[PDB]
């Protein structure tokens, strides 16, 4: 499988030698996904899993990498007989895709913890017979490239992975599992999930990778974690350098989450002469607006998290309001629980702890406080509005009374004189228009000096009665 020109950089003796290999592969007609994943997995294993004996960098010798490569290509070519699945037109068939998915599936250990770190790469698949959920999808695409199936590509939402293939690349197939205790759909299209307007399938506004974006995925999949307290500096540096190489070649243009990841890495350790983290977070949002109909949630959660860490309360609230403005046009469905958890934590933990500190700082005489800024109160209201609108039409409810005490407490962090300055207008000063029926009914409770806690709870939830006695 490996061509002479792919071998000349070995041995890889440094981070920068790995970067050179990626640059060389990205300059070829198609970068070799199997080679590149094996190399990343090898160095991650010796930098994060087992650092015994490490003195600088785990040298990657050609003999070792080539033998791993051979183990993979042998196991795919032996198990998938292409003659059984004739290809017209440089297009693969659904049966062929399912066969490759079965080969990868059936290779995995019978029982293992699927949520472990460092089981994402082909190095893990060969040496441990273990892959995580999205790692199975990647492995299917790398197997298909090894078989010459140029039309098979990785598809990505914000929480799941599958493949596209076939005439004009228009077919979809499930090739891995999603979540825990969901029923397998391997072999099926993603059309039911698109049609139901779930977050999981992004209303069809998901990423369809080319081979360069598949390289970007494996780079984002690097896991620098050594343990709960400690990251590998070496792997952070490697990931950051590889993402800049991809950025410079144009291959992050259509990958919002990769742009957020790079921004996070720049915040941790800035690269001289590169854009600031904010610039990169805003490029991620621009990418989602340009290529994905502004239907992605995480570009705004990346931005909000940066503002939250920097105790920019105003801009954090604005970014979470913008997050909610995206979610409002989805239906909350059965496998969307990750984004539910993201909204729950923001509403019921992160915002409360931000406003509590702001309240203490205001007591100590801070000026320009978010708590005295009616535009900040309007952002809080717009955040709840989008969550309430999300719930409308959904097959499963979102809000419950466990949300209501936090809402009442957060509203209460703003004095009545501040809250009074927002004008809520119906379809001077801040003006806000509510989309959700729940918030429209809430409007007259929002300006009293002391909020009517009980009334708020009734309005936010399905509860319509108070206690009998």
């Amino acid at each position: 499988g490996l061509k002479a020109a792919q071998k000349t950089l070995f041995p890889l003796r440094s981070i920068d030698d790995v970067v050179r290999l990626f640059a060389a592969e990205l300059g070829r007609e198609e970068p070799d996904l199997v080679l590149l994943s094996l190399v990343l997995g090898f160095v991650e294993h010796f930098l994060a899993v087992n650092r015994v004996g490490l003195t600088y960098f785990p040298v990657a010798d050609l003999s070792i990498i080539a033998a791993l490569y051979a183990r993979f290509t042998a196991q795919i070519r032996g198990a998938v007989d292409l003659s059984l699945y004739p290809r017209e037109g440089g297009v693969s068939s659904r049966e062929l895709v399912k066969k490759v998915s079965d080969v990868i599936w059936n290779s995995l250990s019978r029982s293992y913890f699927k949520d472990r770190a460092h089981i994402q790469s082909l190095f893990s698949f060969i040496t441990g017979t273990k892959l995580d959920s999205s790692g199975v999808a990647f492995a299917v695409v790398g197997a298909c490239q090894a078989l010459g199936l140029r039309d098979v590509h990785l598809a990505l939402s914000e929480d799941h992975a599958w493949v596209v293939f076939g005439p004009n690349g228009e077919q979809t197939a499930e090739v891995t599992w999603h979540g825990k205790g969901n029923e397998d759909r391997r072999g099926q299209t993603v059309n039911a999930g698109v049609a139901e307007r779930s977050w999981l399938y992004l209303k069809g506004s998901y990423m369809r990778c080319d081979r360069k974006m598949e390289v970007a995925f494996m780079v984002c999949a690097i896991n620098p974690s050594i343990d709960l307290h400690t990251d590998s500096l070496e792997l952070l540096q490697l990931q950051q350098k590889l993402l800049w190489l991809l950025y410079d070649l144009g291959h992050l243009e259509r990958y919002p989450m990769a742009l957020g990841n790079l921004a996070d890495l720049e915040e941790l350790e800035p690269t001289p002469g590169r854009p600031d983290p904010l610039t990169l977070y805003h490029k991620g949002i621009a990418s989602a607006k340009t290529y994905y109909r502004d239907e992605h949630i995480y570009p705004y959660i990346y931005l909000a998290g940066y503002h939250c860490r920097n105790r920019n309360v105003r801009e954090a609230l604005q970014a979470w309001a913008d997050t909610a403005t995206v979610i409002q046009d989805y239906n909350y469905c059965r496998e969307d629980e990750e984004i539910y958890k993201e909204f729950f934590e923001v509403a019921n933990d992160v915002i409360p702890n931000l406003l509590k500190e702001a309240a203490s700082l205001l007591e100590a005489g801070s000026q320009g406080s978010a708590l005295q800024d009616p535009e900040c109160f309007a952002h809080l209201l717009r955040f709840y509005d989008g969550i309430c609108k999300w719930e409308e039409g959904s097959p499963t409810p979102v809000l419950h009374v466990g949300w209501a005490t936090f809402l009442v407490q957060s509203l209460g962090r703003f004095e009545g004189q501040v809250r009074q300055k927002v004008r809520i207008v119906s379809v001077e000063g801040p003006v806000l228009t509510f989309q959700s029926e729940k918030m429209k009914g809430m409007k007259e409770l929002l300006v009293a000096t002391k909020i009517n806690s009980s009334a708020i709870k009734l309005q936010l939830t399905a509860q319509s009665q108070v206690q009998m006695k």
Binding site: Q120, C220, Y298
Partner: peptide, 9 residues
């Protein structure tokens, strides 16, 4: 377990 490039920890 975190989906590649998901924000936050």
């Amino acid at each position: 377990w975190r989906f590649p490039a998901r924000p936050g920890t």
